[PDB]
Amino acid sequence: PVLRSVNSREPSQVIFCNRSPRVVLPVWLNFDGEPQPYPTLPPGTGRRIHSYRGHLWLFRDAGTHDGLLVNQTELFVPSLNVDGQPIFANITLPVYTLKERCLQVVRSLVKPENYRRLDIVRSLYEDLEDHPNVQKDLERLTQER
Amino acid sequence: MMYVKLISSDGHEFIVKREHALTSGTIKAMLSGTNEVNFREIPSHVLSKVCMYFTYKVRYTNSSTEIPEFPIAPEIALELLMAANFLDC
Amino acid sequence: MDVFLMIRRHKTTIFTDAKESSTVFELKRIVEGILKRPPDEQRLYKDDQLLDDGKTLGECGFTSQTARPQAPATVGLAFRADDTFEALCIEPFSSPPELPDVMK
Ligand SMILES: Cc1ncsc1-c1ccc([C@H](C)NC(=O)[C@@H]2C[C@@H](O)CN2C(=O)[C@@H]2CCCCN2C(=O)C2(F)CC2)cc1
């Protein structure tokens, strides 16, 4: 795959800072490009973690897999530590579209078996079922490279 | 600021900045199709929330300051989704 | 600090922002630009309470905490019809429908 961690073996200390109201799932892209989940971060909590230069991370809502931002972008790559200072990973909500935000709230309230029963145009029904998904997003991100 | 008027199906008039309303490609087209727009299909409890979204989005796009959740009450979520789809917001 | 407002009269609602330090009178100037009624033909309210021209929005209780982009604070507006002021009136928004079964 194109999006994968480089096996640098060069330690990089990182702070995962969760400045979102979501439970955050950190996801490491391993050396084959397969997404590997890591332990979750409660809202407003921090964690010191040991990673490596050239490693790829992205962050999701643990419950729903909604995309989150890290340093105002999607992917975080640990870099060189200056004066032993860990790299801050600021995890934030994006500005979701009004449509996506509505989709999130409706999915949170309605069992997926019942989407078809909602009184909406069929195109919006297809949009509810097409949940956020790491596998989907890497294809998009890989092509935009 | 130049303002524009957005009118809900029940006759409520929401007056918002022009710059804010052009966030919506649909509204931009409706205004260049004048500075007032009528929405036969969007009631005031939905259109009011849409206007708050404009304010919210303009405030927080490209902001390092931590972003709060855009709140949507369940009762209106369904109608707001349909409006967002139409307005492409 | 910016404060985010809805200025409401009858079936009219203006979305605008202002500085915490700006005055009731300066907000009337905003309304004048939009609704073409001079400050002196305007009354502004917090809930039922008439606001004084010279006071800041902060002192009237519009703060960044309470007057947020996604939840703006409401200012009531009443016009002086010719001689005398109408009572403050504000139409509520429409009522949402019942939650569907599959959402309850
Ligand atoms: C508690 C918690 N909350 C949120 S994350 C978290 C958390 C928990 C444990 C860790 C552990 C100590 N470190 C890692 O897994 C780092 C993070 C990323 O670089 C992948 N990797 C690694 O350590 C990878 C993958 C596992 C085998 C070794 N490895 C290497 O590259 C080598 F050297 C060449 C072999 C890191 C974070």
Curated annotation (Swiss-Prot), chain A:
Effect of residue 44 to A: In cerebellar hemangioblastoma
Effect of residue 98 to P: In VHLD; type I-II; abolishes release from chaperonin complex and the interaction with Elongin BC complex
Effect of residue 29 to P: In VHLD; type I
Stretches for region Involved in binding to CCT complex: 40-95
Outcome, altering residue 124 to R: In VHLD; type I
Effect of substituting residue 41 to R: In VHLD; type I
Effect of residue 46 to D: In lung cancer
Outcome after substituting residue 71 to T: In VHLD; type I
Effect on the protein of changing residue 16 to L: In VHLD; type I
Domain of life: Eukaryota
Outcome of swapping residue 47 to P: In VHLD; type I
Effect annotated for changing residue 128 to P: In VHLD; type I-II
Domain notes: The Elongin BC complex binding domain is also known as BC-box with the consensus [APST]-L-x(3)-C-x(3)-[AILV].
Function: Involved in the ubiquitination and subsequent proteasomal degradation via the von Hippel-Lindau ubiquitination complex. Seems to act as a target recruitment subunit in the E3 ubiquitin ligase complex and recruits hydroxylated hypoxia-inducible factor (HIF) under normoxic conditions. Involved in transcriptional repression through interaction with HIF1A, HIF1AN and histone deacetylases. Ubiquitinates, in an oxygen-responsive manner, ADRB2. Acts as a negative regulator of mTORC1 by promoting ubiquitination and degradation of RPTOR.
Protein name: von Hippel-Lindau disease tumor suppressor
Gene that this polypeptide is encoded by: VHL
Residues of the full protein shown: 61 to 205 of 213
Curated annotation (Swiss-Prot), chain B:
Sorted UniProt keywords: Host-virus interaction, Nucleus, Transcription, Transcription regulation, Ubl conjugation, Ubl conjugation pathway
Annotated Gene Ontology cellular component terms: Cul2-RING ubiquitin ligase complex; Cul5-RING ubiquitin ligase complex; cytosol; elongin complex; nucleoplasm
MF terms in GO: protein-macromolecule adaptor activity; transcription corepressor binding
Any one of the GO BP annotations: transcription initiation at RNA polymerase II promoter
Tissue expression as described in the entry: Overexpressed in prostate cancer cell line PC-3 and breast cancer cell line SK-BR-3.
SUPFAM superfamilies the record matches: POZ domain
Pfam families membership: Skp1_POZ (PF03931)
PTM text: Ubiquitinated by the DCX(AMBRA1) complex, leading to its degradation by the proteasome.
Pathway: Protein modification; protein ubiquitination
Compartments it resides in: Nucleus
Subunit structure: Heterotrimer of an A (ELOA, ELOA2 or ELOA3P), ELOB and ELOC subunit. The elongin BC complex interacts with EPOP; leading to recruit the elongin BC complex to Polycomb group (PcG) target genes, thereby restricting excessive activity of the PRC2/EED-EZH2 complex. (Microbial infection) Interacts with HIV-1 Vif; forming an active cullin-5-RING E3 ubiquitin-protein ligase complex (ECS complex).
Family: Belongs to the SKP1 family.
Protein name: Elongin-C
Species for this entry: Homo sapiens
Curated annotation (Swiss-Prot), chain C:
GO CC, alphabetical: Cul2-RING ubiquitin ligase complex; Cul5-RING ubiquitin ligase complex; cytosol; elongin complex; nucleoplasm; VCB complex
GO biological process terms on file: positive regulation of proteasomal ubiquitin-dependent protein catabolic process; protein ubiquitination; protein-containing complex assembly; target-directed miRNA degradation; transcription elongation by RNA polymerase II; transcription initiation at RNA polymerase II promoter
Residue numbers of Phosphothreonine PTMs: 84
Compartments where located: Nucleus
Chief site of localization: nucleus
An example Gene Ontology molecular-function term: transcription corepressor binding
The Ubiquitin-like domain, residue ranges: 1-66
UniProt keyword DNA repair, yes or no: no
SMART domains: UBQ
Keywords: Acetylation, Host-virus interaction, Nucleus, Phosphoprotein, Transcription, Transcription regulation, Ubl conjugation pathway
Function: SIII, also known as elongin, is a general transcription elongation factor that increases the RNA polymerase II transcription elongation past template-encoded arresting sites. Subunit A is transcriptionally active and its transcription activity is strongly enhanced by binding to the dimeric complex of the SIII regulatory subunits B and C (elongin BC complex).
Protein name: Elongin-B
Species in which this protein is naturally found: Homo sapiens
Gene (UniProt): ELOB
